[PDB]
Amino acid sequence: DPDQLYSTLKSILQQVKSHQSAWPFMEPVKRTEAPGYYEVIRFPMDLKTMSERLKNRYYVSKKLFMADLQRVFTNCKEYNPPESEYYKCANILEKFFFSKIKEAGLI
Amino acid sequence: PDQLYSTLKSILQQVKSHQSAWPFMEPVKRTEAPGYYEVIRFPMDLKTMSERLKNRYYVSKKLFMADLQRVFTNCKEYNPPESEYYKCANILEKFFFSKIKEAGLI
Numbered sequence A: 001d002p003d004q005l006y007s008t009l010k011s012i013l014q015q016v017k018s019h020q021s022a023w024p025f026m027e028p029v030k031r032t033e034a035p036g037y038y039e040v041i042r043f044p045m046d047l048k049t050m051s052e053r054l055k056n057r058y059y060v061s062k063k064l065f066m067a068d069l070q071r072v073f074t075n076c077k078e079y080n081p082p083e084s085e086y087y088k089c090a091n092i093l094e095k096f097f098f099s100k101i102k103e104a105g106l107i
Numbered sequence B: 001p002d003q004l005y006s007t008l009k010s011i012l013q014q015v016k017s018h019q020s021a022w023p024f025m026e027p028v029k030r031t032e033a034p035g036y037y038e039v040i041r042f043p044m045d046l047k048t049m050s051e052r053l054k055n056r057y058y059v060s061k062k063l064f065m066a067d068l069q070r071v072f073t074n075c076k077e078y079n080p081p082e083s084e085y086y087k088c089a090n091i092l093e094k095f096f097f098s099k100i101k102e103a104g105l106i
């Protein structure tokens, strides 16, 4: 069922975006704010871009959606220090993310 | 190539000796983890990574990172956020990233 998947992913993504630790991940990181970011990170990802991909019917499987969302987190942990606010936010939001996937029974 | 090999060996060994590595040392058994292999399609562990290393599979940083990252993401996907295993995954992942940055791999 394609619109089953779509509705579930929309719901999940929207809850992730509304989470209080989502703020670092809402938009493409700007080169002005992140020194040499696009030299280090070859596959940049963010929640805006994920919203568009969703709207564009790109997420035809769980696996694709997970991959982009995990990329958000791995980009962040690759680039930032472990005790930085952004790294902490990545793990809080990841925990939340997994709890919402488990809730939905996405399999 | 033996530059890469030595660096990866060193990193992997340090990861395996870390006090939070214990959940990841061997393949998870279906007897101990209900429906694990239904949820997790690409299982990974540090024993298996040691073998792959010895087997000269890790010809690039990217391949090594991928398998090690998979160890953590498998664990977080399957376990509760406040479970001991989930906590260990993040402690060990932090340690891991600090060691790869130290070596100038990523």
Ligand SMILES: CNC(=O)c1cc(OCC(=O)Nc2ccccc2)ccc1OC1CCOCC1
Pocket: A023, A024, A025, A026, A027, A028, A029, A030, A033, A034, A035, A075, A076, A079, A080, A081, A086
């Ligand atoms: C997911 N967001 C980031 O990874 C990020 C990192 C940023 O880090 C700057 C920096 O100097 N980081 C750094 C510090 C020490 C060592 C290496 C990198 C700055 C803005 C960043 O993007 C956010 C995008 C919108 O929210 C505010 C900033």
Ligand SMILES: CNC(=O)c1cc(OCC(=O)Nc2ccccc2)ccc1OC1CCOCC1
Pocket: B022, B023, B024, B025, B026, B027, B028, B029, B032, B033, B034, B074, B075, B078, B079, B080, B083, B085
């Ligand atoms: C990386 N290891 C695991 O993910 C794991 C999960 C296991 O599942 C236990 C379990 O019931 N987890 C669970 C708890 C609440 C809800 C769903 C699953 C069992 C053994 C597991 O690994 C073994 C424990 C450490 O010793 C060797 C491997």
